Amino acid sequence: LCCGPKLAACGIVLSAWGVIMLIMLGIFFNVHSAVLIEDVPFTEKDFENGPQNIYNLYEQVSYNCFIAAGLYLLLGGFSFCQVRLN
């Protein structure tokens, strides 16, 4: 019926692969604390006191993957719902 599978299978694949690699990336940002070999970029301009606030930033940036993964899962659920409309 509405929004058949022929054009929602792409959404399904994209959502699944996206949740996969963002959970991997969040895991590598909070547990590895985004080691620089894997993630050079960092948002500070003054770190001459110590590495602690850089760690706090590492948790801050790894926090950004939870919203990502969660609403991709929402999009995947909605895509499955569109697919079930037969």
Partner: protein
């Protein structure tokens, strides 16, 4: 000699080394297996897309190709422009580099970089987990990877050529044609074995022989090869790679 049993393998690996990427290989195999699952479905299915027909007709190629591509990406430690941190890096620590007559140049390092000269005395050595990830950060990684990849590509090509040419012997013996052996195959193997196996042993010997301590006055394989090819041998100014090689 049917060449199917040899292409069936070597074509995969050569694509894989020409396609040295981990996650891209993963995606290719994912799509390949997706086709594998619905084989009997598509066989009883009518379509007009003819590129699609040529590809599911050759799915046996692409699946194995993708497996080897994933494996090659595992070699190069390049999964989407990044390397997995096994943390086997064995290059630098605080007290060592400060013990190399150095301190607090990072105060000036806000504007400069200060490459470290090699031979610290304690660092180096092999990295069993492939390419050491530290290179991914260094902006001089181009020289390292260029020399590396160029040399291994040349050697792989030499090996493939030398192996592949040998099937003419099977041809010559099966058809009782040693006439193609006498004034043929034998001098062929002679010139190729010399001209390329010599280079192979040269690079192996250089890699096994010289260290960064002897970097000064260290020749290059290029200059030796061109000197040999050109009949030109200077009387001095360039030390041999080994005694008596002239």
């Amino acid at each position: 000699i049917n060449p199917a049993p040899y292409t069936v393998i070597t074509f995969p690996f050569l694509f894989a080394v020409m396609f040295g990427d981990f996650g891209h290989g993963i995606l290719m195999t994912l799509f390949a297996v997706w086709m594998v699952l619905r084989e009997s479905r598509i066989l009883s299915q009518k379509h007009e897309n003819e590129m699609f027909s040529m590809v599911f007709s050759g799915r046996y190629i692409i699946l194995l190709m993708g497996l080897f591509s994933i494996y090659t990406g595992l070699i190069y430690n390049d999964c989407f422009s990044k390397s997995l941190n096994i943390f086997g890096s064995s290059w630098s620590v605080r007290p060592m580099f400060t013990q190399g007559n150095w301190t607090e140049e990072t105060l000036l390092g806000s504007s400069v970089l200060q490459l470290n000269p090699a031979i610290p005395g304690v660092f180096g050595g092999p990295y069993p987990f492939g390419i050491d990830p530290i290179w991914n950060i260094a902006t001089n990684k181009l020289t390292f990877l260029n020399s590396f990849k160029m040399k291994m590509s040349v050697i792989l090509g030499i090996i493939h050529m030398l192996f592949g040419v040998s099937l003419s012997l099977f041809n010559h013996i099966y058809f009782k044609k040693p006439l193609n052996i006498y004034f043929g195959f034998i001098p062929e193997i002679i010139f190729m074995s010399s001209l390329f196996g010599y280079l192979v042993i040269l690079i192996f010997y250089k890699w096994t022989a010289y260290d960064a301590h002897s970097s000064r006055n260290a020749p290059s394989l290029l200059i030796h090869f061109i000197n040999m090819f050109l009949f030109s041998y200077p009387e001095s100014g360039n030390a041999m790679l080994y005694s008596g090689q002239k």
